[PDB]
Amino acid sequence: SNLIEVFVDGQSVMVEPGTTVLQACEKVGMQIPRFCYHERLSVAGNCRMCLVEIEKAPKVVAACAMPVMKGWNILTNSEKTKKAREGVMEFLLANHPLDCPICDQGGECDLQDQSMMFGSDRSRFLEGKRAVEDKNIGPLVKTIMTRCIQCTRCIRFASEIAGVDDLGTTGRGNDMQVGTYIEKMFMSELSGNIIDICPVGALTSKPYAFTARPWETRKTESIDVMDAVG
Amino acid sequence: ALFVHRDTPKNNPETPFDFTPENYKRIEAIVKNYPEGHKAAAVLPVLDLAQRQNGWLPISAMNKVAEILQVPPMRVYEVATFYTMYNRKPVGKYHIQVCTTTPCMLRNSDSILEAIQKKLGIKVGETTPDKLFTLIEVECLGACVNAPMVQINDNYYEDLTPKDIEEIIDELKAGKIPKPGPRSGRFSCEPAGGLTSLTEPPKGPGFGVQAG
Amino acid sequence: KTSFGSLKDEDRIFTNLYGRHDWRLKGAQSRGDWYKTKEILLKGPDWILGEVKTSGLRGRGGAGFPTGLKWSFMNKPSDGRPKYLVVNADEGEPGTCKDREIIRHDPHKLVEGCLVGGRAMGARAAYIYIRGEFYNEASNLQVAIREAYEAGLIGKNACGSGYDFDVFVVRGAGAYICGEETALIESIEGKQGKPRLKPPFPADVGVFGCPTTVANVETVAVSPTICRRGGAWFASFGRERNSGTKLFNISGHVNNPCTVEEEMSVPLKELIEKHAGGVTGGWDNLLAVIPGGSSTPLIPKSVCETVLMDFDALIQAQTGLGTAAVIVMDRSTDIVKAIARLIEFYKHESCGQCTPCREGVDWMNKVMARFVRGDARPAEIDSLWEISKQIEGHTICALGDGAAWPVQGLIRHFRPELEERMQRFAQQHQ
Amino acid sequence: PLMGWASTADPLSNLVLTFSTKEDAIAFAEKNGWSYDVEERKVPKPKSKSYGANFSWNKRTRVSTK
Amino acid sequence: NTTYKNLQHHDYSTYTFLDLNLDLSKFRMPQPSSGRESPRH
Amino acid sequence: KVDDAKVSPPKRAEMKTSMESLIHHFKLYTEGYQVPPGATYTAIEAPKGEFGVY
Amino acid sequence: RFRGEHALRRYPSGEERCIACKLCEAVCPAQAITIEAEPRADGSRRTTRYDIDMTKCIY
Ligand SMILES: Cc1cc2nc3c(=O)[nH]c(=O)nc-3n(C[C@H](O)[C@H](O)[C@H](O)COP(=O)(O)O)c2cc1C
Ligand code: SF4
Ligand code: SF4
Ligand code: SF4
Ligand code: SF4
Ligand code: FES
Numbered sequence A: 001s002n003l004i005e006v007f008v009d010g011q012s013v014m015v016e017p018g019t020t021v022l023q024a025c026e027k028v029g030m031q032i033p034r035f036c037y038h039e040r041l042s043v044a045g046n047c048r049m050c051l052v053e054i055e056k057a058p059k060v061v062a063a064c065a066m067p068v069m070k071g072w073n074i075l076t077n078s079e080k081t082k083k084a085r086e087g088v089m090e091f092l093l094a095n096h097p098l099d100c101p102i103c104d105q106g107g108e109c110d111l112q113d114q115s116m117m118f119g120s121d122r123s124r125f126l127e128g129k130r131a132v133e134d135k136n137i138g139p140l141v142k143t144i145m146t147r148c149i150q151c152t153r154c155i156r157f158a159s160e161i162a163g164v165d166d167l168g169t170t171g172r173g174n175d176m177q178v179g180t181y182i183e184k185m186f187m188s189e190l191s192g193n194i195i196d197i198c199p200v201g202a203l204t205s206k207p208y209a210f211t212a213r214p215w216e217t218r219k220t221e222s223i224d225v226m227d228a229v230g
Numbered sequence B: 001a002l003f004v005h006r007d008t009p010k011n012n013p014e015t016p017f018d019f020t021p022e023n024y025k026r027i028e029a030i031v032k033n034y035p036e037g038h039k040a041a042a043v044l045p046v047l048d049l050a051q052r053q054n055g056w057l058p059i060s061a062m063n064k065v066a067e068i069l070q071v072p073p074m075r076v077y078e079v080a081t082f083y084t085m086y087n088r089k090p091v092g093k094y095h096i097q098v099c100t101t102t103p104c105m106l107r108n109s110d111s112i113l114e115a116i117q118k119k120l121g122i123k124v125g126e127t128t129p130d131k132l133f134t135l136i137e138v139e140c141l142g143a144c145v146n147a148p149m150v151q152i153n154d155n156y157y158e159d160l161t162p163k164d165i166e167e168i169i170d171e172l173k174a175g176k177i178p179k180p181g182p183r184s185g186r187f188s189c190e191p192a193g194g195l196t197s198l199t200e201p202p203k204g205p206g207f208g209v210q211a212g
Numbered sequence C: 001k002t003s004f005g006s007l008k009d010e011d012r013i014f015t016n017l018y019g020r021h022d023w024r025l026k027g028a029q030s031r032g033d034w035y036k037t038k039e040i041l042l043k044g045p046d047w048i049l050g051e052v053k054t055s056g057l058r059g060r061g062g063a064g065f066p067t068g069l070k071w072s073f074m075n076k077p078s079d080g081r082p083k084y085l086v087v088n089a090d091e092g093e094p095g096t097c098k099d100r101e102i103i104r105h106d107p108h109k110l111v112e113g114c115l116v117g118g119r120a121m122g123a124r125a126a127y128i129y130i131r132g133e134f135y136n137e138a139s140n141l142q143v144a145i146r147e148a149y150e151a152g153l154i155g156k157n158a159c160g161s162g163y164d165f166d167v168f169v170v171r172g173a174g175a176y177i178c179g180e181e182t183a184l185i186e187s188i189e190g191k192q193g194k195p196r197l198k199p200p201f202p203a204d205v206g207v208f209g210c211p212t213t214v215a216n217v218e219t220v221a222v223s224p225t226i227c228r229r230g231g232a233w234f235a236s237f238g239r240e241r242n243s244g245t246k247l248f249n250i251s252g253h254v255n256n257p258c259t260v261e262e263e264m265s266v267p268l269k270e271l272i273e274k275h276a277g278g279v280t281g282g283w284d285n286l287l288a289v290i291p292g293g294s295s296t297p298l299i300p301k302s303v304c305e306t307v308l309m310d311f312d313a314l315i316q317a318q319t320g321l322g323t324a325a326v327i328v329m330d331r332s333t334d335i336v337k338a339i340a341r342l343i344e345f346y347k348h349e350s351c352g353q354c355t356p357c358r359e360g361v362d363w364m365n366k367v368m369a370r371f372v373r374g375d376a377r378p379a380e381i382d383s384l385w386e387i388s389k390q391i392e393g394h395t396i397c398a399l400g401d402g403a404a405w406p407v408q409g410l411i412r413h414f415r416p417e418l419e420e421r422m423q424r425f426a427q428q429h430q
Numbered sequence D: 001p002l003m004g005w006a007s008t009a010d011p012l013s014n015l016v017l018t019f020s021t022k023e024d025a026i027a028f029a030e031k032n033g034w035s036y037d038v039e040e041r042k043v044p045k046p047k048s049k050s051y052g053a054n055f056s057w058n059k060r061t062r063v064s065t066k
Numbered sequence E: 001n002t003t004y005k006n007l008q009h010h011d012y013s014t015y016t017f018l019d020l021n022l023d024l025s026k027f028r029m030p031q032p033s034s035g036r037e038s039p040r041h
Numbered sequence F: 001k002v003d004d005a006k007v008s009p010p011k012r013a014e015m016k017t018s019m020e021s022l023i024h025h026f027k028l029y030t031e032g033y034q035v036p037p038g039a040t041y042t043a044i045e046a047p048k049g050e051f052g053v054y
Numbered sequence G: 001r002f003r004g005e006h007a008l009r010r011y012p013s014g015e016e017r018c019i020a021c022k023l024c025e026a027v028c029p030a031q032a033i034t035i036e037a038e039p040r041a042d043g044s045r046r047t048t049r050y051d052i053d054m055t056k057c058i059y
């Protein structure tokens, strides 16, 4: 009656039909590290981080978008799973600029946490390191677009929650500028909610910009006002 | 090469831009080919009509195409920034693509690049202080089986040498245009020895087949 | 079994290489089109798939997926969603002219074959995608579509019988990536050409949500000939996994570079010199030979004098056979320079979906620059080897993999020129 | 008033006690005497998403961008 | 036959592809619809 | 130092041009490296005596 | 390499070298650093209040 058997490193668990490897792996507690997938939006696959060596397959496959055949066994802690994570995490930090002081996501990066906890240490890629000059999206949202890892999270958020359709991919190869082509200051509702979407320090708050870095500030539960929903 | 618009009028919507009702009939043929429910699939042929009509597309062309196909313009800006055949810079009458990658570069396109350069004067990748000589070198096109190649406005030139460069470019100055096909004889992609292909007039349906 | 095989005349699957008797459906009928096709169609598509898997068609375009498995996946029961057939006609692998010859000299057999495929799997309309480089040949294709419509035999109610089948043509806009398996599908969809994810197959969701598929042009051309001819007559030329006839083309560096049909295997010395003039400077002049095109590792001289030309053979040589560019290159150019220019091509055309191809081709472009100028250390050439081990298969498409392999072949074979180049740069700076 | 700092007369201001079950939390708080407010745990709600559903035909869940 | 039977391609103007698509727009069976007229309607 | 740069911070040259060594510098001095759970004891010979630490 | 005065530096004919990147107050083992940062009218991120206690500073 609508079950799927998987072994997560031996520990069996049961999966609803049609779902992902990732929701069951998050069902047993193992958060596979992710960048493009986020549960309020659709599924891109363009961050490629969620590779996991799923057995009897020479090709290591993504886990945010794999249909779950009956009777898997999902090797998370293998050798070449770690080697694929080493490779991908080394690839992200090539054309990313040395901004972790003047980045506004020092306590709250994602490259920083996941590249400590999963990546290499000795870098390579000795020369190069191109840079994309920023835009002027809206005076409430400060915007640096060299740090954009082109992860297509703001784009899907626009076209699938905002419905505004003002952010687009432009270009090919390395050169993918992400934004609005026509010097238009993008202003719409919920554009304040895009600085919480952008996982890396490329879309920050403009008025908050440079007053604190978030280990100092303590976090407290409260209830909203000004809307009747809270 | 500057993938953000930054108006610079002779752009700056509205630049006044409109087609011909004959081209509107082309438009309705194009978005009546594709199935209903997915009107947004004919964006690239409509934009091709806009380029073939007016040699390069301004931004008001993109607003026009967006309102014709009743889409947000952002998809049109993506498809305009994404491909190769659409040049957002204004160009001249004739456009030059000097194609050179793998057999084309090793069969000495650098001689042809020198010939084009020291005949024309304007440097590679750039434009010209007249019309009809927007020169860019390009990557592979497909027609590789000869000398490195030239594409001008929907035509080819293969089997080159700088005297043919002088001739063809003087004639595009004059207005007269030679053939898309090959040179040095050998009227197609031919085995250029002693015709090692088939020779007999082929039989076809006449001889031994089975179940039909 | 043949002794390595060669061209035996009239066993050519399609004649009319160039400029033959006319360019017309009448000439197509004289060369063998529209002959007894209705009796093949009205037997049921299962017998057509039996004919094709009897022939054992290895898929073309340099992938390896056989047509019988693909179109046997295409035997889904037809639900409310229509079925579509897409004829891909770009020419990547620079050096190609694979189907440029075919769509320039004979569109009619392609029309026959797309009718065959539209009957053979339940398809309803076929979109044919031509490269944007090919306006004139595209208009030749348009004239042929007009001739086949003006015959009143395709379009609606084909072969007389009540079976409509419409065919359209969509231009390219210039890409390597529009030729691939899925970025084709969404380039037709009006969104920008970017591949999807594979485990949702095109035969389950395709063009907007239809069970469709994509055929290479050579498959479309070979389809009605094997439908109108016998079973396993196609299979008699070469080995058992791969079978049939293939265009091996020297588009490259010989005297009279050209294109020839041959059988599935051939001795490479006959192939190079006894059909297309001779090698520029003789057999011993060349440094190396690339088969396949550009998504294929190199083959050096001591391997090229002996290795036969089969798909299994180039598996046994750790490469992958593609089409149309089985060419030599001379000692007189540096293979480092040639492959570095190919890497620059790879940078200039790649979409930006996957992180690893994007940044790997970025590094490899800059590192091959630092090798042509020679400004590195031997740990860098092994670094390039390690990163080409990292990239491969970790993407969506195979452009990243076909950028992994040339660096691989250059490292597997042509170490010594690299070492001498770096040594001469040491002599230069010192 | 000399440096611009935030003093406090609250020695208990920087307590935190990380526990593992709500039962032992309440047991400790009532064992040590002071009052307590219980807010309940909230998991993320499981969803139903798929890439093929992002490629719809006559369903409106359509990717529209890529 | 050793003569170039083409040059039938040679006359092709830069509008002819859309001209042929224009004139061959009869027998267009209905390109089957689905629910709404468009993805966003 | 160790070359296991996820424990000891790197030096200035790679710090001023890396990316990984800069990130490791940054987070290694903000958070402190994570230490696996468990209880250890050791003792060395202080010139007093058993300098033990638990 | 003596450790004394707690002095600051600046760029060659340039502005203040401190970005106010809060690392010193994040590491300061008696928390004697007190940084409150603001941008100015230019745009480069800078400070407001950079205080060292000499009492708590263990050097
Ligand atoms: C890297 C890559 C490049 C491709 N380039 C082309 C191309 O230029 N033209 C083309 O028709 N197909 C191209 N394809 C598709 C292949 O030809 C593929 O085999 C085709 O979709 C089906 O061919 P088959 O079924 O005969 O194997 C490409 C595929 C890949 C992975
Ligand atoms: S701006 Fe941020 S969310 Fe958008 S693609 Fe770039 S990194 Fe991702
Ligand atoms: S997002 Fe910010 S903190 Fe993270 S790596 Fe980039 S610059 Fe550093
Ligand atoms: S490997 Fe590169 S070109 Fe291919 S799908 Fe991925 S991002 Fe696109
Ligand atoms: S905040 Fe501290 S660590 Fe950062 S620049 Fe200023 S003095 Fe240096
Ligand atoms: S999470 Fe980004 S690829 Fe699956």
Ligand code: FES
Pocket (backbone or CB within 6 Å): B099, B100, B101, B102, B103, B104, B139, B140, B141, B142, B143, B144, B148, B149, C094, C095, C096
């Ligand atoms: S490389 Fe010049 S056309 Fe293919």
